[PDB]
Amino acid sequence: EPAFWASIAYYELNCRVGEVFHCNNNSVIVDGFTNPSNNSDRCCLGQLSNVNRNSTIENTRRHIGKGVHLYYVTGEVYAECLSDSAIFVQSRNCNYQHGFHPSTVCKIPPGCSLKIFNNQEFAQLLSQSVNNGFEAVYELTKMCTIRMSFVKGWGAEYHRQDVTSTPCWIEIHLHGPLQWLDKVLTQMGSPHNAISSVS
Amino acid sequence: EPAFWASIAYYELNCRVGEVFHCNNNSVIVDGFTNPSNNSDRCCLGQLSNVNRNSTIENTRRHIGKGVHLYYVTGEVYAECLSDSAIFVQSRNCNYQHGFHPSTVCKIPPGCSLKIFNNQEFAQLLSQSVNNGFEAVYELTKMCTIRMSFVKGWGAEYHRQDVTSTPCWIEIHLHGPLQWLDKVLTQMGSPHNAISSVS
Amino acid sequence: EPAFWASIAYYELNCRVGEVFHCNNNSVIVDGFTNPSNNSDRCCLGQLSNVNRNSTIENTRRHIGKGVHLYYVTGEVYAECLSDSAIFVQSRNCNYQHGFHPSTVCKIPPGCSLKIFNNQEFAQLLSQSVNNGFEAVYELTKMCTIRMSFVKGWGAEYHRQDVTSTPCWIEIHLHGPLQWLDKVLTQMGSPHNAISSVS
């Protein structure tokens, strides 16, 4: 249905770095090398520039290497750690599809794989949370974004508590889900407690 | 003449959020829902991401809803508040076309409408300010951008004094005007007091 | 080989301003006027917006005028100062092709010209630094970006020590070089001292 199944924006700490990548090929790689082809469907982080860069970020960028392979197949998306260092994923849909806390950050060690989005499991939540409120379904908006860190992990068991603390990370928007979510939201009504224009 | 009649970039406070939208359809909507189609010509704010986000911004984003409808017709552009909360517009051309101070921020309450750019009124200023200086016509550059806030207002009568203080707002560039302005500027000469390269 | 020979992003101080321009025409101009055509292959800085802008930046933007002409021919790229004020270039490849320190910032006074990238000279470095390490060739990544300031200079002989200190400047990525560099890096191996995921 959508021209792209995902889009990916990259950051270094809390500052967006480089253009947004959009994916139509079902298999995309985000690596740390230097090819600029927006076509190909390699998202190459290595040729993103940043003068604000520091040593701990430069070092990390040199260990992304092969990076992450993100495979869209039917309704599911899996992420594979091709890099020689681990990646770390925070997916609310995956944290649900299992049984973890919504803020759970999972490790995908090198060579490993993980379903990070379940288009079915999501589809439920959608319907379950329709007759559950409006803001109920607004929050699902949070499920269609997945955050992923290269090398350095964050949260429970690390010093880094926020993804914005990690040197190299990406944000993945799943356009499939967002479109279905959109269909639902456009047929509903604003929250209760209206909103002040001054405060 | 131009491929797009406008482009719109969105911010939350003082940080740009999301990609720039470009408009070729004469009617565009900027709403708070979650459709990613760059085609359609709905600019959907709800699927823009931000970890730096805070509670007062999240709340506002949930009241944008239907948002603003921006209608380009002949030379004029009107803005219509479809949202259940008001939008606030700062248009130098509209502040002139009327008689307000250039920094005047106008409210468009829900259901209301307002001509925010007058392609004629602008056209005058252009000619009047040609034989009025160069920096005279450089400043017109400021007229081709319009800033607009959702829900929270800013300036006179609010605590918020700068648009950068508002949680959710957009910046609209009118490519029609800019092109005509460009035609004029390329035939002129730099300002008087030349410029130091050290200070 | 690449769809674009360069891309250029603009900044004001340390904040990215406006969209990235991509160049396929061998001759591009970056000026300070107001045409939005992404086609043309004029990159027009004057119609980039910024509320965070200050007086010293506004003044500079008004002296860019004709700006810089960047000519890609065969393997070489030359930069010509069309502006009435000088531009300042930091090109690691040019600093090498000559004999300067890598951080050397060169002035191109109005009317002047300068080869800022030598596709041959680069080609050497590439091969020389293959059997010289991996991180050896990773650093070449730094050579394919060129930073350029309008009017105000930076570094040795000025108060401004960092390009991020200059009010108006651009970052140019040479996609030719990056692609060849990419070919090389994808056939190699990560650095020695592996990397901690916690620190």
Q: What tokens appear for A30 in the block?
A: 């985000």
- How far apart (Å, rounded) are the C-alpha atoms in residues B72 and B115? 10
Resolution in A: 2.8
Look at residues C44, C50, C92, C47 and name the one whose alpha carbon lies nearest to residue C68: C44
C-alpha to C-alpha distance for C91 and C105, rounded to whole angstroms: 8
CA-CA distance, B169 to B12, in Å (whole number)? Answer: 6
Residue B55 contacts A, CB cutoff 8 Å? no
What would the two tokens of residue A134 be? Answer: 């409006």
Residue C65 with chain B: CB contacts under 8 Å: 190
Which residues of chain A have a CB within 8 Å of the CB of B46? 138, 141, 182, 185
| Structural contact between residues B5 and B176, judged by C-beta atoms closer than 8 angstroms | yes
Q: Which residues of B touch C39 (CB under 8 A)?
A: 3
Pairwise CA distance, residues C111 & C86, whole Å? 9
Residues in chain A: 199
Return the closest-CA partner of residue C48 out of C89, C9, C100, C93: C9
Contact check, Cβ <8 Å, B141/C65: no
Give the DSSP letter string of B35-95. ---TTTSEEEGGG---TT--HHHHHHHHHHTT-EEEEEETTEEEEEE-SSS-EEEE-HHHH
- Please give the backbone phi and psi of residue B62, each rounded to the nearest 5 degrees, phi first: -85, 5
Min Cα separation B191/chain A (Å): 32
User: Which chains contact B through at least 3 pairs of Cβ atoms less than 8 Å apart?
Assistant: A, C
Compute the count of residue pairs across chains B and C with CB atoms less than 8 Å apart: 78
Residue pointed to by tokens 């911010």: B11
Please name the residues between 118 and 137 in chain B that touch chain C, using a CB distance below 8 Å: 135
* Interchain contact, B191 vs C38, CB within 8 Å: no
> Is residue B93 a contact partner of residue B143, using CB atoms and an 8 Å limit?
yes
Structure tokens of A144?
A: 């269609």
Q: Which of A66, A57, A80 is nearest to A31 (CA)?
A: A66
Nearest Cβ partner for B178 among C36, C56, C84: C36
Cα B100 from Cα B107, distance rounded (Å): 13
Closest CA to C159 of A194, B146, B198: B198
Give the pair of three-digit tokens for residue B44.
């959907």
Q: Do B179 and C86 touch (CB under 8 A)?
A: no
What SS3 class is residue C23? strand
Q: What are the residues whose beta carbons fall under 8 Å from the beta carbon of B102, sequence distance 6 or more?
A: B92, B95, B96
Residues of B within 8 A of C46 (CB-CB) are 138, 141, 182, 185
Of residues A20, A138, A186, nearest to B19 (C-beta):
A20
For chain A, list the domains and their CATH numbers.
Answer: 1-199 (2.60.200.10)
Q: Give the C-alpha distances (Å, rounded to integers) separating B6 from A34, A114, B18, B120, B176.
A: 33, 42, 17, 17, 8
d(CA C146, CA B51): 31
Question: How were these coordinates obtained?
Answer: X-ray
**What's the first-to-final CA gap in chain B, in angstroms?**
40
State how far the Cα of B44 lies from the Cα of B8, in Å rounded to an integer: 11
Question: B105-116 in b/e burial notation, b at 16+ Cβ within 10 A?
Answer: bbebeeeeebbb
Q: Please give the C-alpha separations between residue C95 and each of A65, B178, C102, in angstroms, as whole numbers.
A: 28, 38, 6
CA–CA dist B128, A104 (Å, integer) = 62
C84 in contact with B, Cβ within 8 Å = yes
The DSSP code sequence of C114-152 is: EEEE-HHHHHHHHHHTTBTBSHHHHHHGGGGEEEEEESS
- Cβ neighbours of A142 in B, within 8 Å: none
Q: How far is CA C61 from CA C32, C42, C67, in A?
A: 6, 16, 10
Q: What gap in Å lies between CA A131 and CA A154, rounded to an integer?
A: 35
* Beta-ladder partners of A72: A77
> Which of B46-49's residues contact partners 24+ apart within 8 Å by CB, and which partners?
B46/A138, B46/A141, B46/A182, B46/A185, B47/A141, B47/A144, B47/A173, B47/A178, B47/A182, B48/B10, B48/B17, B48/B18, B49/A9, B49/A145, B49/A171, B49/A173, B49/B17, B49/B18
- In contact, B91 and B62? CB cutoff 8 Å: no
* Contact (CB, 8 A) for B6 and B169: no
Is C15 in the A-facing interface, judged by CB distances under 8 Å? Answer: no
DSSP A13-58: TTEEEEEEEEE-SSEEEEESS----TTTSEEEGGG---TT--HHHH
Contacts of B38 (CB under 8 A, 6+ apart): A3, B21
Longest dimension (CA), chain B: 53
Alpha carbon separation from A136 to A130, A172, B31, B113, C21 (Å, rounded): 7, 22, 19, 31, 40
Q: Which residues of A are less than 8 Å from C199 in CB distance?
A: 56, 152, 159
